[PDB]
Scaffold this motif. Structure first.
Motif, mmCIF file in Angstrom:
data_model
loop_
_atom_site.group_PDB
_atom_site.id
_atom_site.type_symbol
_atom_site.label_atom_id
_atom_site.label_comp_id
_atom_site.label_asym_id
_atom_site.label_seq_id
_atom_site.Cartn_x
_atom_site.Cartn_y
_atom_site.Cartn_z
ATOM 1 N N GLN A 170 39.248 -12.213 -9.284
ATOM 2 C CA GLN A 170 38.162 -12.448 -10.532
ATOM 3 C C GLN A 170 38.666 -14.043 -11.849
ATOM 4 O O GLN A 170 39.826 -14.086 -11.005
ATOM 5 C CB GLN A 170 38.288 -11.361 -11.823
ATOM 6 N N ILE B 131 41.384 -7.673 -15.854
ATOM 7 C CA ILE B 131 40.705 -8.070 -14.866
ATOM 8 C C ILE B 131 41.464 -7.654 -13.593
ATOM 9 O O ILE B 131 43.110 -7.254 -13.670
ATOM 10 C CB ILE B 131 40.821 -10.106 -14.755
ATOM 11 N N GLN B 132 40.637 -7.289 -12.503
ATOM 12 C CA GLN B 132 41.264 -7.622 -10.866
ATOM 13 C C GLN B 132 41.263 -8.831 -10.272
ATOM 14 O O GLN B 132 40.820 -10.184 -10.273
ATOM 15 C CB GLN B 132 40.233 -6.491 -10.328
HETATM 16 CL CL CL Z 1 38.048 -7.802 -12.428
#
Ligand code: CL
Ligand code: QUQ
Ligand code: QUQ
Lengths: 298, 302
Positions: free
Chosen positions: B110, B106-107
């Motif tokens: 998130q 994930i970024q």
């Molecule tokens: Cl993400």
């Protein structure tokens, strides 16, 4: 370290969620052994008159992609008990418990017998829950997990005009002066669960937040006079006793923490936060704090 | 109606939690098919932690050194390999409770649910966001290492986080399920510090749209802003820069409420300037940043 609004693992409850359809109404059911429990408003009022007109095959019960055949039906207060042919193999060790205001529990929100989310809730002193429910969420359950036993305490029935929620215990008895029908109903004036705010102040102390502490103490009566002014629930000697372990662990007497709450109530936070919050949190019981700050598993 | 910090039902993940023991160290493992994934620091002693050569430590271990416990059943480790900072313990039993799953990285900004475990036993579930500084503000005690973060979209569990350590500020650092850390962190007891954190702007705007959908409009104003003027103001309050991607991502919420993203930005600029003035938004006196635009749509529609 860290303090989060934590819910109980929902797995045991997920294995009990089914879809109940009666006519055009679709809501959630709790399948324990060979009985499916759901709000009686699924048949919608003279509930005895409406129920006597229904046959077993009118109630379509769905467990995943498998239809369960209803072999009997009975009403217990505001819950409909649909006797089915199949006993749920995923039935956990369970109890039906009625909770008191201030007590917390996890809610497994479902739509079409499918769990979509889990969140932590408190039974407000006004017998409503500040939940997160959309249409189709009726029949979603609230629970606590004690060792390996699931204590079912709530079944969602309706939403009040203020966006708060009303429901019953698993025996169909409503929490609050509510009824399961479309009529003018309103949530009463709410109050803050004092014992829970104090418990959350102890959780902030355990996590290194001490700015709100002071050298002062108070009598329980002096504090209850202050609490009543801020729409806080009266703190009883039982609450004081219940906070005993947290008081011993942090070295801050319950009435010493009460004097901190007194100053927070009269002076505010002054731009500061406690456990990442600018408001005094009241949806963690003293047991929730001990369970999260010591590490109890299920 | 209502808006809660909602976690995904943990059941699918609960059926994967196992206990992994290596010498004196005990932590959690994620059992998917015939592999148990766990932090590689399970092989370390508390001393080794400063500068451990994990390849050197792992080559000295045999399969029978790793005791894996699934409930009241000991699993037999038949192989072991290291992938970045995760240890992959091949076992002789495929988990029957293995759900449909994916490993997703994930970024920042998130969100995901965390099933906190101790000794392979789930104790709680809560909602989390990957902070812009690549840390998570979790609730973890000793023995929580190996607890996982996930999202459940439809019937597939997207594993996105495995807990590895607590930083000195009480915040948590970990890896994706391929062993790659989020952030500039290492699985070592060396001097490590979380960078200065920022507010996830797109998430605050998403939560303001959630408040609008729930009837809270007090914070709205007659103003709009350019994206550049918003970021110049946002940066002064330690808010993450809002990108055109974020503006596009907020499109559906903007259409549903009828408030343009840059008008919602003007409301945020004003809330940053004025504060709340004793008022709350969705029961909160602070601007909430741990609900993504996707979370708001899912909770306010289905
Ligand atoms: Cl993400
Ligand atoms: C039209 C309507 O709102 N209802 C009237 C009503 C009256 C009495 C009883 Cl016991 C049930 C109900 C149902 C009801 O409250 N359903 C709902 C439950 N939880 C959240 C909701 C959120 C949006 C809409 C419905 C929701 C249906
Ligand atoms: C200082 C310490 O206890 N440890 C050093 C360390 C360094 C590097 C790595 Cl990869 C792991 C770890 C472990 C570690 O962070 N464990 C813990 C994880 N999550 C919450 C905790 C809360 C209180 C204590 C430990 C916690 C152990």
């Amino acid at each position: 370290s860290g303090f989060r609004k934590m819910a109980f693992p929902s797995g045991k409850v997920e294995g009990c969620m089914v879809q109940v359809t009666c006519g055009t109404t679709t809501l959630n059911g709790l399948w324990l052994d060979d009985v499916v429990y759901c709000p009686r408003h699924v048949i919608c009022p003279n509930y005895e008159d409406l129920l006597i007109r229904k046959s077993n095959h009118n109630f379509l019960v769905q467990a995943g992609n498998v239809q369960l055949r209803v072999i009997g039906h009975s009403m217990q207060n505001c819950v409909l008990k649909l006797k089915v042919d199949t006993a749920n193999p995923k039935t956990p060790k369970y109890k039906f418990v009625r909770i008191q205001p201030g007590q917390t529990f996890s809610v497994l929100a479902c739509y079409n017998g499918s769990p979509s989310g889990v969140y932590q809730c408190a039974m407000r002193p006004n017998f409503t829950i500040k939940g997160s429910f959309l249409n189709g969420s009726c029949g979603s359950v609230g629970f606590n997990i004690d060792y390996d036993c699931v204590s079912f305490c709530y079944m969602h029935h309706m939403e009040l005009p203020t966006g708060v929620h009303a429901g019953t215990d698993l025996e169909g008895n409503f929490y609050g002066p509510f009824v399961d029908r479309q009529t003018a109903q309103a949530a009463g004036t709410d109050t803050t669960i004092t014992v829970n705010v104090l418990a959350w102040l102890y959780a902030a102390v355990i996590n290194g937040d001490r700015w709100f502490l002071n050298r002062f103490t108070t009598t329980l009566n002096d504090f209850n006079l202050v609490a009543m002014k801020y729409n806080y629930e009266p703190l009883t000697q039982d609450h004081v006793d219940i906070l005993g372990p947290l008081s011993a662990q942090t070295g801050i007497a319950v009435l010493d923490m009460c004097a901190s709450l007194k100053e927070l109530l009269q002076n505010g936070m002054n731009g500061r936060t406690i456990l990442g919050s600018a408001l005094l949190e009241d949806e963690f019981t003293p047991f929730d704090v001990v369970r999260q700050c010591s590490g109890v598993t299920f």
